[PDB]
Write a protein that holds these residues in place. Sequence first.
Motif, PDB file in Angstrom:
ATOM      1  N   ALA A  29       0.811  -1.234   0.000  1.00 44.24           N
ATOM      2  CA  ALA A  29       0.000   0.000   0.000  1.00 44.24           C
ATOM      3  C   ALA A  29       0.840   1.277   0.000  1.00 44.24           C
ATOM      4  O   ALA A  29       0.521   2.263   0.673  1.00 44.24           O
ATOM      5  N   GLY A  30       1.912   1.275  -0.782  1.00 41.91           N
ATOM      6  CA  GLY A  30       2.730   2.462  -0.878  1.00 41.91           C
ATOM      7  C   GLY A  30       3.579   2.756   0.332  1.00 41.91           C
ATOM      8  O   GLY A  30       4.199   3.824   0.388  1.00 41.91           O
ATOM      9  N   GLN A  31       3.622   1.845   1.302  1.00 44.59           N
ATOM     10  CA  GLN A  31       4.461   2.030   2.477  1.00 44.59           C
ATOM     11  C   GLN A  31       5.910   2.233   2.055  1.00 44.59           C
ATOM     12  O   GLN A  31       6.396   1.601   1.114  1.00 44.59           O
ATOM     13  N   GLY A  32       6.599   3.140   2.740  1.00 45.71           N
ATOM     14  CA  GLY A  32       7.960   3.465   2.374  1.00 45.71           C
ATOM     15  C   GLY A  32       8.099   4.421   1.210  1.00 45.71           C
ATOM     16  O   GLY A  32       9.207   4.921   0.970  1.00 45.71           O
ATOM     17  N   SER A  33       7.028   4.690   0.477  1.00 46.06           N
ATOM     18  CA  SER A  33       7.010   5.716  -0.555  1.00 46.06           C
ATOM     19  C   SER A  33       6.456   7.017   0.014  1.00 46.06           C
ATOM     20  O   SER A  33       5.917   7.066   1.124  1.00 46.06           O
ATOM     21  N   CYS A  34       6.620   8.081  -0.762  1.00 41.85           N
ATOM     22  CA  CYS A  34       6.102   9.397  -0.421  1.00 41.85           C
ATOM     23  C   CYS A  34       5.485  10.009  -1.662  1.00 41.85           C
ATOM     24  O   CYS A  34       5.964   9.787  -2.779  1.00 41.85           O
ATOM     25  N   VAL A  35       4.411  10.761  -1.470  1.00 44.06           N
ATOM     26  CA  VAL A  35       3.787  11.501  -2.563  1.00 44.06           C
ATOM     27  C   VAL A  35       3.569  12.930  -2.104  1.00 44.06           C
ATOM     28  O   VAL A  35       2.932  13.166  -1.067  1.00 44.06           O
ATOM     29  N   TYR A  36       4.132  13.869  -2.853  1.00 41.20           N
ATOM     30  CA  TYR A  36       3.903  15.295  -2.660  1.00 41.20           C
ATOM     31  C   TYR A  36       2.679  15.723  -3.461  1.00 41.20           C
ATOM     32  O   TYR A  36       2.647  15.539  -4.683  1.00 41.20           O
ATOM     33  N   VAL A  37       1.679  16.285  -2.783  1.00 42.25           N
ATOM     34  CA  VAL A  37       0.491  16.800  -3.452  1.00 42.25           C
ATOM     35  C   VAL A  37       0.642  18.316  -3.540  1.00 42.25           C
ATOM     36  O   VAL A  37       0.535  19.039  -2.551  1.00 42.25           O
ATOM     37  N   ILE A  38       0.922  18.803  -4.737  1.00 42.00           N
ATOM     38  CA  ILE A  38       1.198  20.214  -4.971  1.00 42.00           C
ATOM     39  C   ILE A  38      -0.111  20.831  -5.447  1.00 42.00           C
ATOM     40  O   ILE A  38      -0.521  20.635  -6.595  1.00 42.00           O
ATOM     41  N   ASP A  39      -0.774  21.568  -4.549  1.00 39.66           N
ATOM     42  CA  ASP A  39      -2.151  22.002  -4.748  1.00 39.66           C
ATOM     43  C   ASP A  39      -2.564  23.109  -3.778  1.00 39.66           C
ATOM     44  O   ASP A  39      -1.734  23.923  -3.359  1.00 39.66           O
ATOM     45  N   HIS A  46      -7.770  15.278   8.790  1.00 38.48           N
ATOM     46  CA  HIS A  46      -8.844  14.401   8.345  1.00 38.48           C
ATOM     47  C   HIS A  46      -8.568  12.955   8.767  1.00 38.48           C
ATOM     48  O   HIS A  46      -7.526  12.397   8.396  1.00 38.48           O
ATOM     49  N   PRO A  47      -9.470  12.322   9.522  1.00 38.14           N
ATOM     50  CA  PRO A  47      -9.225  10.933   9.960  1.00 38.14           C
ATOM     51  C   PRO A  47      -8.887   9.973   8.826  1.00 38.14           C
ATOM     52  O   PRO A  47      -8.172   8.992   9.048  1.00 38.14           O
ATOM     53  N   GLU A  48      -9.373  10.233   7.615  1.00 38.04           N
ATOM     54  CA  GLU A  48      -9.081   9.361   6.486  1.00 38.04           C
ATOM     55  C   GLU A  48      -7.588   9.276   6.152  1.00 38.04           C
ATOM     56  O   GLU A  48      -7.170   8.299   5.526  1.00 38.04           O
ATOM     57  N   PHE A  49      -6.773  10.253   6.564  1.00 39.52           N
ATOM     58  CA  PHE A  49      -5.333  10.168   6.327  1.00 39.52           C
ATOM     59  C   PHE A  49      -4.595   9.414   7.422  1.00 39.52           C
ATOM     60  O   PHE A  49      -3.487   8.922   7.171  1.00 39.52           O
ATOM     61  N   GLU A  50      -5.185   9.313   8.622  1.00 38.69           N
ATOM     62  CA  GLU A  50      -4.700   8.478   9.721  1.00 38.69           C
ATOM     63  C   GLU A  50      -3.395   8.992  10.317  1.00 38.69           C
ATOM     64  O   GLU A  50      -2.641   8.227  10.923  1.00 38.69           O
ATOM     65  N   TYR A  82     -10.426   6.152   0.232  1.00 38.20           N
ATOM     66  CA  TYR A  82     -10.525   6.658  -1.128  1.00 38.20           C
ATOM     67  C   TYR A  82      -9.213   6.616  -1.903  1.00 38.20           C
ATOM     68  O   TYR A  82      -9.221   6.897  -3.105  1.00 38.20           O
ATOM     69  N   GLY A  83      -8.108   6.206  -1.277  1.00 39.05           N
ATOM     70  CA  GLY A  83      -6.806   6.264  -1.904  1.00 39.05           C
ATOM     71  C   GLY A  83      -6.330   4.967  -2.552  1.00 39.05           C
ATOM     72  O   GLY A  83      -6.746   3.870  -2.183  1.00 39.05           O
ATOM     73  N   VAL A  84      -5.427   5.132  -3.532  1.00 36.09           N
ATOM     74  CA  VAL A  84      -4.790   4.008  -4.226  1.00 36.09           C
ATOM     75  C   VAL A  84      -3.691   3.392  -3.370  1.00 36.09           C
ATOM     76  O   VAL A  84      -3.612   2.169  -3.212  1.00 36.09           O
ATOM     77  N   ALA A  85      -2.801   4.219  -2.841  1.00 36.16           N
ATOM     78  CA  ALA A  85      -1.672   3.769  -2.017  1.00 36.16           C
ATOM     79  C   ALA A  85      -1.940   4.168  -0.574  1.00 36.16           C
ATOM     80  O   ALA A  85      -1.546   5.246  -0.139  1.00 36.16           O
ATOM     81  N   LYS A  86      -2.601   3.276   0.169  1.00 38.46           N
ATOM     82  CA  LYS A  86      -3.196   3.612   1.462  1.00 38.46           C
ATOM     83  C   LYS A  86      -2.186   3.746   2.594  1.00 38.46           C
ATOM     84  O   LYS A  86      -2.524   4.286   3.652  1.00 38.46           O
ATOM     85  N   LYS A  87      -0.961   3.261   2.418  1.00 38.17           N
ATOM     86  CA  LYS A  87       0.043   3.357   3.467  1.00 38.17           C
ATOM     87  C   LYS A  87       1.186   4.288   3.083  1.00 38.17           C
ATOM     88  O   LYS A  87       2.187   4.363   3.806  1.00 38.17           O
ATOM     89  N   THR A  88       1.040   5.023   1.980  1.00 42.02           N
ATOM     90  CA  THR A  88       2.044   5.998   1.569  1.00 42.02           C
ATOM     91  C   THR A  88       2.013   7.213   2.492  1.00 42.02           C
ATOM     92  O   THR A  88       1.043   7.452   3.222  1.00 42.02           O
ATOM     93  N   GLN A  89       3.101   7.980   2.466  1.00 43.43           N
ATOM     94  CA  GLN A  89       3.192   9.228   3.210  1.00 43.43           C
ATOM     95  C   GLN A  89       2.864  10.400   2.298  1.00 43.43           C
ATOM     96  O   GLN A  89       3.290  10.432   1.144  1.00 43.43           O
ATOM     97  N   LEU A  90       2.095  11.355   2.810  1.00 43.90           N
ATOM     98  CA  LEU A  90       1.606  12.478   2.023  1.00 43.90           C
ATOM     99  C   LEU A  90       2.168  13.781   2.562  1.00 43.90           C
ATOM    100  O   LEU A  90       2.077  14.052   3.760  1.00 43.90           O
TER     101      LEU A  90
END
Length: 279
Positions: A29-39, A46-50, A82-90
């Motif tokens: 689930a994307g653990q160990g990866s990171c995604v930057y949301v530039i927005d 939000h509890p959905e991000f945990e 709602y996410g594709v990679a549920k264990k990634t860092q945002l």
Amino acid sequence: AAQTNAPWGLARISSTSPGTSTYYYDESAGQGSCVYVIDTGIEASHPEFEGRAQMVKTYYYSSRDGNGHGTHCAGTVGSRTYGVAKKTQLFGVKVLDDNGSGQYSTIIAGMDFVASDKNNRNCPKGVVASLSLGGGYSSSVNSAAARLQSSGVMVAVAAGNNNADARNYSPASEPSVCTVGASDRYDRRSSFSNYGSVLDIFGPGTDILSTWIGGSTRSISGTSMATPHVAGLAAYLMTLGKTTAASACRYIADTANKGDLSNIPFGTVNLLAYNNYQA
């Protein structure tokens, strides 16, 4: 794994036919990866991000998502439901104001920021950048994205919602980043989605349930919504070791559902993002 009653886009990603409702994925689930949301930012509370989301940069009086669009896209990358990679860092970078607007000088500054900031963060599986933004053609903006890509970040950018050729929009027209078109739950090209040869891949983009500000959710549409599906996926696979930052876009297009969308003009690829996870 399986997520029953998932948003149609998550199910689409995991399937070879439209109309299903379970999203199949590897528990990594994307653990160990990171995604930057530039927005416009992220509502990290939000509890959905945990607790996996956090802001790291703002260019305005507040780093709060006063609009929801940034929070929506982040939810598509890595929120639990709602996410594709549920264990990634945002990581949130607020280059757009609470009306969704932003100067190019700021977006450029935001992309250069991520290229250096990944060096303060633990991302042993690699780094992705989701850019649900764009405007008219700008060579400095395109060069900004290509630098970010060359720096070692998987960049996914939206093609545009002008129902036209994305060659006249930026960063969409930059060849080295990943330019995402939008499709709908009937595998039609979204009525608004830009097209053209610069496009690399299509993702779910019409009526996309995800997070919203205020501890809430809602469904919106746009190539802003397909971009984070592709962003999450790259991060997913990178964690899986299937691909690297520099090659993810080619990998995703190489392993997509080919020829399955309707109303793709001549000259535009017919590739729908797909995780080919055999459970």
